Write a protein that binds this ligand. Structure first.
Ligand SMILES: CC(C)(C)OC[C@@H]1C(=O)NCCN1C(=O)C[C@H](N)Cc1cc(F)c(F)cc1F
Ligand SMILES: CC(C)(C)OC[C@@H]1C(=O)NCCN1C(=O)C[C@H](N)Cc1cc(F)c(F)cc1F
Lengths: 725, 728
């Protein structure tokens, strides 16, 4: 009866099986079989080989990924993959003509391409090379150069810079096809005056001299990149004259100061929706711009604007939600925080200001998943009032009282956390259950909500897990100021509540974050409970999301206060539970969780014995502007410079004499720069506090390389076991 | 004797060694700082006098870092805003104070951001370097004359050295050399146009939002080196012409065939300057004595005055060809060179004669020439009692080299076995500086009879404090390996009992031509480990160490990381077989070169060592600068010695680190041994999955000498040593 060991987690012994499918039409999806790609008929479950690996085993390159054209007449081959940031990367591409059954060797896609994408229909092709946009009406024909101002580290056409990739759009891409591929909208970011963050990269041992990486990176209060938006007609590309792009400008209420482009969504074939967001991220405006044939220009009627603001904090969770327009584009549904601070779906009209909420309650709609003529499919945490749960719902557009949950009752014993993937027209949908039981994948029919087939049930994994002493998970809540605050505990096998165990507080506690959910996980905490009999707990206090703006906006303009104090208060109640050794309580966290961990260890509460901080934030003036300023405003005396200086971990170095501290950070961290940890170590030296440290050469914010990953979790294990004796 | 020497005592500097730093201003007088007030002493009778009261500048507005009085005693340079650059370079602000008027200058002042200042040997002329250019002030209050115009940041250095020359060649920031009487100003010019830049982050105070990137021209092994030119300008002509002409002195033809260095500048007379050049392959150097042609105003270097100093079994010199010591007429000089037996002694040269004659000989070496008179030549050596780790002052008679007398051997034989000396102007008096094995002792002497005039400082106050302290003892002895004496030292804990088993810490450096076992008395981290933690701190000078003959120093030639590393392991086994060493508790730590050796030792698989600490270590020799590395390893090309470059990396031994506890420490702002080197060590240990302890120090250089970091590193290393030795 072995236990889940550290080797199991580091070597991925027990692996969850997925069912990652991509919908091709309203009733077909592609699936990978390790040797080929199969086309599945959603209605009957039969399949047929769409493309076998014996088609590119002669290529001479390692196939990184494939991209079928919407009409299934070409495929895009990705190779020479080179990662950049969280989403950005670079690769080489080769289009394979499914009709000629051979590669396209004429007018090939250039090497070092930054982003490629088909049109929504047909086989048009837009790609970004050297920060300039190109369009191919045909894969074999020459490409049409759309932009000419592309310049590395300054001008970005069709691609996002660093801050927009990480904080706004969560993608390298800045291209938006029209529904039928006629128009191609894109954004232009300009980092001319944006200060560059510089750090050393050491590379392989052969490199005699280290290289200096420089990235345009606006820290809190620095000069942000400017943005422009354009739309070009891809049906009239002139082979003789240059392409003519039409610029859509932001509303007057946004040009008064610094602002952002935070959302782009096409309504109809000639109507596109833009959402702008002031640098003070509590005021946003949606523009609905239509095309005018007689003038070849895009106009955004003032009467069709839509303001979305907040007085308790920022607008949106991390950005204003995306709209879902109706068939005629004259109406749309989108998630906005209601009057009491609970985010729900509001029915909008293109012409009028007032919207009408179609959902209500002391819970939140996580996201709108699909929209049809009669139904609106969304995910929420309404079932059993558990904020850590996720279920799929359908609300009738003609009668808001007819709401139906499509996943609540399928298997309430093993499934409480759901995601979904709909077909092209939402005729079928795949449900992705991920807890508390083993993940489960099912295929359903939208017309009657009947379960067609079981795609993946992890029955093979369930069998192996029966021969290992696996830990349990306890999801509950405690009361703070007459408010429910949820927590979770990874409990060791054979848990005895009369026995006493060491407790480790696994923390993140970022704004709109959630560490207490019903998701089933096989992670480092699994090993700590199964093998080391350690209770690893997580707590969602003030600042956590999916529980209303009263809890989420509580940390507005005062990061590093309530969410830090609540972690201490929660661990304080944990120590008085009888099964927790109050002399052996630790706390560790990554990224924002490293900041909270360091602020807790420097709080002088005396509750924690030791703690680990991995790639932590130490001084909010060091992190990027879009994220920091969203919760802290500007670091100016006339704004919020007080909390900026009052919430550093360096100012608490003196209180680090009570605890054992392990500080870890990667030298190539483009996100939370090594500077942050270098200033923490320097402050502890100035006050004479001893501590443990560890850098990782050329590792980024993830420290995700195979060898480094195993090394850090091995090093942290020794630190924890040594602190618990 | 109840209290031990605690770690706190070392970090807080409870027991301070008393010093006596004097500055000879004339033939019989020197300056001395009593209590912020500069005193002038008469060596003949000891009576003093006030030269600058302590309140003269306590109302200056700035904290004075150091003073510099003109040789004629009419002015005094006051530098403030001192900011250390490299080991010797620094930037500061300066002010000239007129002594004949007791006022500041306030007119045509020395510009801010001045990189170097220096007086003329006589008078009160002034030459300084600003924005990589040279300026000369005839009078401290009159406008200055610009000598160079090619000065360019990080590209052209005029009057100052670049990073390599400062660290590896001249051991000084200054590249200026006044003529003896001050008529001529000889300077060097360095061009780092194509020299690659080392780049690393500097974070500064936490108020700085964006980390700063430091960029320094740093030629690593094999990279392109800086080029050098030499010039001489006549400062007496600055007044009558608008742009004085600087006469260039080119190097001999035997140096222009390839890359070379300028390794020594030494004036001989008022119109005779000698330059020593060195090929990039540092086994061939050439001295070039040049005279001033009063007729044509040029400098000519007669081929018959050349002197070739080479080596057939390694590099030439210790760290560089030694400097010559000319007589008054400048027609002959004495110089330290390696003899046919490989022992460095003093040779007597004539300006024309290619052959010299050695005046000293034996299985021992001369450390340096101190003073030269018409009668005697004073030098320091380790001849006494055949102890390579001892230092004594000798006096050899010029008219009969068989008449050699030791001036410090028998002064205090039990208390003093390590000596340095500071002679007066014409060597009429000298101060003997004793530094071990007993407490430091300073004495003044008259060179007429070498009579002990008086005791300037005897550390009597410090002696009484150490009476009620359990200080450690020191054993300086040797072992015989392959029929050769190799010396070692041990800091033995108090009440040392050979019937007991003690833990052993092996303090290592073992760089080429270095010495860790000597007679110097020290109050350092080793004193605490022995006095309080009962740990024996041992050091061993194996193959590669200096002051013992070329057969030992040149042993590791082109083989760094081999003989010196293995000799350290063998010394540990030798110490374990002595009886009083616990075999299961032997550690080894080292700084800089010692960190490299420590890492190579811990990655050797010897099984001798349980743990080890490496501070600012070298990882591979292709990461270190050219002039130092190539001197011992040649060029990292396949045709010469690339194989030994790649074979002696610590990364290549990463697998063996699974058998030891490893602590790696390095400062992020290390300009000497770049953080890159420790960054490659850790990344290699991660690639093979071996756990280890790490510690970076933000914005600390190769010394990690900031008050707070210094206390932090020795506190951190103490915990690691005590836990590895199971020490409570
Ligand atoms: C990216 C992620 C988690 C996968 O989810 C996206 C999520 C989201 O909801 N919208 C867009 C972006 N996003 C964020 O969380 C942005 C933050 N920069 C994440 C973050 C916060 C820190 F405090 C910190 F120190 C480092 C750090 F990286
Ligand atoms: C500077 C010192 C000690 C005070 O003595 C001067 C001494 C000398 O004798 N002549 C001139 C220069 N010099 C040297 O030792 C030069 C070396 N760069 C020192 C050194 C060696 C390393 F292997 C290493 F990793 C780092 C490092 F700094």
């Amino acid at each position: 009866r072995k236990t889940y060991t550290l080797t199991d987690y580091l070597k991925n012994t027990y692996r969850l099986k997925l069912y990652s499918l991509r919908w091709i039409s309203d009733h077909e999806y592609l699936y990978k079989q390790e040797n080929n790609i199969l086309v599945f008929n959603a209605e009957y479950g039969n399949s047929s080989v769409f493309l076998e690996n014996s088609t590119f085993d002669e290529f001479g390159h390692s196939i990184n990924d494939y991209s079928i054209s919407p009409d299934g007449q070409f495929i895009l081959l990705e190779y020479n993959y080179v990662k950049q940031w969280r989403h950005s990367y670079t690769a080489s591409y080769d289009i394979y003509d499914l009709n000629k059954r051979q590669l396209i060797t004429e007018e090939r896609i250039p090497n070092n391409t930054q982003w490629v994408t088909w049109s929504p229909v047909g086989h048009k092709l837009a790609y970004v090379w050297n920060n300039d946009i190109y369009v191919k009406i045909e894969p074999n024909l020459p490409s049409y150069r759309i932009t000419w101002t592309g310049k590395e580290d300054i001008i970005y056409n069709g691609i996002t810079d660093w801050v927009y990739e990480e904080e706004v759009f969560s993608a390298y891409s800045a291209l938006w096809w029209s529904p039928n591929g006629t128009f191609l909208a894109y954004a232009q970011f300009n980092d001319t005056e944006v200060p560059l963050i510089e750090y050393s990269f050491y590379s392989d041992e052969s490199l005699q001299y280290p290289k200096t990486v420089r990235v345009p990176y606006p820290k809190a209060g620095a000069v942000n990149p400017t943005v422009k938006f354009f739309v070009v007609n891809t049906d009239s590309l002139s082979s003789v004259t240059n392409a003519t792009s039409i610029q859509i400008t932001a509303p007057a209420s946004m040009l008064i100061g610094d602002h952002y482009l935070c959302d782009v969504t096409w309504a109809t074939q000639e109507r596109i929706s833009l959402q702008w967001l002031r640098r003070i991220q509590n005021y946003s405006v949606m523009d609905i711009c239509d095309y005018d044939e007689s003038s070849g220009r895009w106009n955004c009627l003032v009467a069709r604007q839509h303001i979305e603001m907040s007085t308790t904090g920022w607008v949106g969770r991390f950005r204003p939600s995306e709209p879902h327009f109706t068939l005629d584009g004259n109406s749309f549904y989108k998630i906005i925080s209601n009057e009491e601070g609970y985010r729900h779906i509001c029915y909008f009209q293109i012409d009028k200001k007032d919207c009408t909420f179609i959902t209500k309650g002391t819970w939140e709609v996580i996201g709108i998943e699909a929209l049809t003529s009669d139904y609106l499919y969304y995910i929420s945490n309404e079932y059993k009032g558990m904020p850590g749960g996720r279920n799929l719902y359908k609300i009738q557009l003609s009668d808001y009282t007819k709401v139906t949950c499509l996943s609540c009752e399928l298997n309430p014993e093993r499934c409480q956390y759901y995601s979904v993937s709909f077909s092209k027209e939402a005729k079928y949908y795949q449900l992705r259950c991920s807890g508390p039981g083993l993940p489960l994948y099912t295929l359903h029919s939208s017309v009657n909500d009947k379960g067609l087939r079981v795609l993946e049930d992890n029955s093979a994994l369930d069998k192996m897990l029966q021969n290992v002493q696996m830990p349990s998970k306890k999801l509950d809540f405690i009361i703070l100021n007459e408010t429910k605050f949820w927590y979770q505990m990874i409990l060791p096998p054979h848990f005895d509540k009369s026995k006493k165990y060491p407790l480790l507080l696994d923390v993140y506690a970022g704004p709109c974050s959630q560490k207490a959910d019903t998701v089933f996980r096989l992670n480092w905490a699994t090993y700590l409970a199964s093998t080391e009999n350690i209770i690893v707990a997580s707590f969602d206090g003030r600042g956590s999301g999916y529980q209303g703006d009263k809890i989420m906006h509580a940390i507005n303009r005062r990061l590093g206060t309530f969410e830090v104090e609540d972690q201490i208060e929660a661990a304080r109640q944990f120590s008085k539970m009888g099964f927790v050794d109050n002399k052996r309580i630790a706390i560790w966290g990554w990224s924002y969780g490293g900041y909270v961990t360091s602020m807790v260890l420097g709080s002088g509460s005396g509750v924690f014995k030791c703690g680990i901080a991995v790639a932590p934030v130490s001084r909010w003036e060091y992190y990027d502007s879009v994220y920091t300023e969203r919760y802290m405003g500007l670091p100016t005396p006339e704004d919020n410079l007080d909390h900026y200086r009052n919430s550093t971990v360096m100012s608490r170095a003196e209180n680090f004499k009570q605890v054992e501290y392990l500080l870890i950070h990667g030298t190539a961290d483009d996100n939370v720069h090594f500077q942050q940890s270098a200033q923490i170590s320097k402050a502890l030296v100035d006050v004479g506090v001893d501590f443990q440290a560890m850098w990782y050469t050329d590792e980024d914010h993830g420290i995700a390389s195979s060898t480094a990953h195993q090394h850090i979790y091995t090093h942290m294990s020794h630190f924890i076991k040594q602190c618990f004796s």
